Write a protein that holds these residues in place. Structure first.
Motif, PDB file in Angstrom:
ATOM      1  N   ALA A 105       1.094  -1.271  -0.091  1.00 45.43           N
ATOM      2  CA  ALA A 105       0.374  -0.228  -0.057  1.00 45.43           C
ATOM      3  C   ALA A 105       0.508   1.174   0.310  1.00 45.43           C
ATOM      4  O   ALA A 105       0.441   1.933  -0.711  1.00 45.43           O
ATOM      5  N   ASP A 106       1.629   1.115   0.343  1.00 49.46           N
ATOM      6  CA  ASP A 106       3.014   2.370   0.743  1.00 49.46           C
ATOM      7  C   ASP A 106       4.283   1.928   0.872  1.00 49.46           C
ATOM      8  O   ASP A 106       4.572   1.265   2.271  1.00 49.46           O
ATOM      9  N   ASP A 109       6.741   3.008   4.127  1.00 45.97           N
ATOM     10  CA  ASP A 109       6.123   2.452   5.240  1.00 45.97           C
ATOM     11  C   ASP A 109       7.237   1.268   5.969  1.00 45.97           C
ATOM     12  O   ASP A 109       7.065   0.321   5.099  1.00 45.97           O
ATOM     13  N   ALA A 129       2.794   2.637  -4.171  1.00 48.67           N
ATOM     14  CA  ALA A 129       2.133   1.181  -3.853  1.00 48.67           C
ATOM     15  C   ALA A 129       2.671   0.964  -5.185  1.00 48.67           C
ATOM     16  O   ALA A 129       3.036   0.817  -6.261  1.00 48.67           O
ATOM     17  N   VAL A 152      -0.584   6.549  -1.926  1.00 45.09           N
ATOM     18  CA  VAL A 152      -0.459   5.201  -1.240  1.00 45.09           C
ATOM     19  C   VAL A 152      -2.228   4.640  -1.609  1.00 45.09           C
ATOM     20  O   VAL A 152      -2.822   5.261  -1.984  1.00 45.09           O
ATOM     21  N   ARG A 153      -2.641   3.091  -1.763  1.00 48.13           N
ATOM     22  CA  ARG A 153      -3.121   2.630  -2.123  1.00 48.13           C
ATOM     23  C   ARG A 153      -2.953   1.084  -1.843  1.00 48.13           C
ATOM     24  O   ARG A 153      -2.673   0.086  -1.804  1.00 48.13           O
ATOM     25  N   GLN A 154      -4.149   0.495  -0.648  1.00 50.88           N
ATOM     26  CA  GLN A 154      -4.962  -0.281   0.076  1.00 50.88           C
ATOM     27  C   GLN A 154      -5.453  -1.064  -0.995  1.00 50.88           C
ATOM     28  O   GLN A 154      -6.931  -1.198  -1.717  1.00 50.88           O
ATOM     29  N   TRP A 155      -4.691  -1.992  -1.759  1.00 46.04           N
ATOM     30  CA  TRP A 155      -4.707  -2.847  -2.493  1.00 46.04           C
ATOM     31  C   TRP A 155      -5.965  -3.984  -2.207  1.00 46.04           C
ATOM     32  O   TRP A 155      -6.317  -4.979  -0.941  1.00 46.04           O
ATOM     33  N   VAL A 156      -6.387  -4.575  -3.197  1.00 50.10           N
ATOM     34  CA  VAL A 156      -8.084  -4.895  -2.804  1.00 50.10           C
ATOM     35  C   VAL A 156      -7.629  -6.348  -2.998  1.00 50.10           C
ATOM     36  O   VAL A 156      -6.910  -6.959  -4.414  1.00 50.10           O
TER      37      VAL A 156
END
Ligand code: CYC
Length: 179
Positions: A105-106, A109, A129, A152-156
């Motif tokens: 996601a990052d 991080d 990301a 940033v991207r929270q992948w599903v």
């Protein structure tokens, strides 16, 4: 008499015509496969609304090159770039051959655990990301990769699962058809 051309230069030319038919089909098949891979990265980039989608091909000595890319014009192109083994170590190429995936996601991080030099490398391309799935032939042939660059991207989970399913069909092509 006559008939000397039939079993000499006309039959020579006929074999050459048949081989020419076959060689032009083979080159068109190479074009069509690269078109399908290009359409796949361009459509996956549009569907994910990712900032870059690419296919990275590794050679047996672990060096690599981008073979297909779709990138928004605000961000660098990886198309022409060749990289040494050190950007993607052979130990990790083997874990990918054995089905490793990553959905990060990052990249900045610290809990994502990326090598400092790898964070520096992905920064060259404005990457925040990354989603990574392998293409095998098992030996690694390459990676199907999505990047987010703007955020940033929270992948599903389904994005990771269906990216893997696309890479698995590329793997079958590069294997069972011997394409
Ligand atoms: C250190 C000087 C160099 C380095 C080391 C390193 N890399 C990895 C793992 C990976 N490297 C890549 C490479 C790419 N990701 C992409 O998005 C692209 C296209 C822009 C490439 C070429 C990938 C996918 C991985 C795997 C990450 C994973 O955890 O699965 C490692 C091992 C893992 C770690 O973080 O320690 C190492 C040690 N990489 C560099 O680029 C430096 C030049």
């Amino acid at each position: 008499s006559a008939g000397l051309s039939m079993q000499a230069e006309l039959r020579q030319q006929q074999q050459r015509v048949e081989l020419f038919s076959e060689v032009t089909l083979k080159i068109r098949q190479s074009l069509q496969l690269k078109e399908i891979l290009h359409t796949t990265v361009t459509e996956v980039q549009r569907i994910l609304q990712a900032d870059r989608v690419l296919i990275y091909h590794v050679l047996p000595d672990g060096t690599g090159k981008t073979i297909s890319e779709s990138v928004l014009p605000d961000y660098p192109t990886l198309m022409d770039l060749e990289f040494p083994q050190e950007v993607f170590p052979q130990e990790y190429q083997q874990l990918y051959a054995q089905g490793r995936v990553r959905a990060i996601a990052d990249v900045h991080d610290p809990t994502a655990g990326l090598a400092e030099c790898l964070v520096e490398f992905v920064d060259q391309f404005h990457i925040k990301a990354k989603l990574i799935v392998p293409i095998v032939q098992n030996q690694l042939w390459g990676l199907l990769i999505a990047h987010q660059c703007d955020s940033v991207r929270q992948w599903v989970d389904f994005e990771l699962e269906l990216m893997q399913q696309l890479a698995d069909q590329i793997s079958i092509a590069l294997s069972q058809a011997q394409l």
